[PDB]
């Protein structure tokens with residue numbers, strides 16, 4: 001199998017990582033899958049102390065959903081998705097996803113070493129470049145840092161970045177990106 | 191026709207605007223097409239005094255190519271594509287474009303009032319979100335401004351943003367985004 005056949009390129013691919021909880025329910029969270037060669041079946045992801053890492057340590061199985069849905073990224077950055085977000089429970093396939101794939105994973109020093117074993121394209125799409133989508137994704141990077149730090153000066157700097165990206169989403173984004181951004185603002189206490 | 195059927199959403203859609211020069215050749219430049227209702231056939235673009243605007247004043251015809259190709263954006267940001275970038279000379283499709291559209295355009299003091307009249311979906315695709323692609327697009331916004339202005343304080347601000355986005359492209363982008371960023375650095379005098 002080739003990573004490129006499921007929407008991955010070399011570089012870092014921001015996807016929704018779906019992993020099985022101990023009770024059999026799914027956990028969904030954004031992660032960046034790092035790819036050196038998209039013609040290959042190997043990749044990796046460096047994971048923080050979160051449910052994704054805890055599940056992969058136990059199960060060694062990671063599903064990925066390839067999606068450009070700002071809302072799914074915003075919600076899953078701050079909490080789990082509910083069953084209502086899924087079009088399919090097995091394999092797990094969030095509504096609106098363009099593709100899914102399955103990786104076997106081996107954790108070493110906080111890095112999930114991945115081997116692609118299955119997947120399918122669900123829906124190819126066309127969308128013009130949208131800076132509002134870019135802005136939601138960047139804001140998520142800063143907001144997730146913002147909530148993890150106590151420094152008032154560092155937080156001030158991050159909030160300025162978040163406001164900068166908010167102006168872009170308000171000007172450029174579709175209603176879906178604007179909705180996603182309001183989730184970010186709510187979650188961080190703004 | 192409906193804008194949504196050719197890849198446009200409400201908001202601003204960054205596309206490649208292709209317009210006819212005085213000599214019949216094509217001019218290509220990134221432009222944002224502003225959409226209030228993607229179910230409709232109407233849109234707008236706000237244009238500075240550039241070749242796209244001058245060409246629309248003469249012809250009232252705007253072709254749009256919907257593409258996610260970082261290299262097409264970077265090259266067209268700083269000049270014309272010429273003739274090797276096109277899969278079709280008429281209607282102008284750029285190689286790799288996902289869709290093309292044709293708009294009638296009425297210029298009203300820098301605002302192009304657009305009506306969608308023709309178009310085709312060429313190729314639907316799938317690509318995971320990539321922050322390197324985001325960063326190329328942001329850097330192009332700042333770099334096209336940088337090269338057009340003389341303010342020292344403003345150029346200083348813009349160069350800082352460009353350097354910030356460069357780091358994101360190096361970390362996250364594919365080789366295609368990296369190649370696109372190399373064009374930016376060359377064009378701003380940091381090659």
Ligand SMILES: Cc1cc2nc3c(=O)[nH]c(=O)nc-3n(C[C@H](O)[C@H](O)[C@H](O)COP(=O)(O)O)c2cc1C
Nearest residue numbers: 204219220221222236237238240241242267330331
């Ligand atoms: C993503 C992006 C969007 C842009 N949108 C616009 C726009 O909507 N209106 C405008 O006047 N310039 C816009 N620009 C700047 C022009 O593309 C740039 O100045 C170019 O040199 C104009 O070329 P032309 O003289 O061939 O029209 C945009 C640039 C980027 C990279």
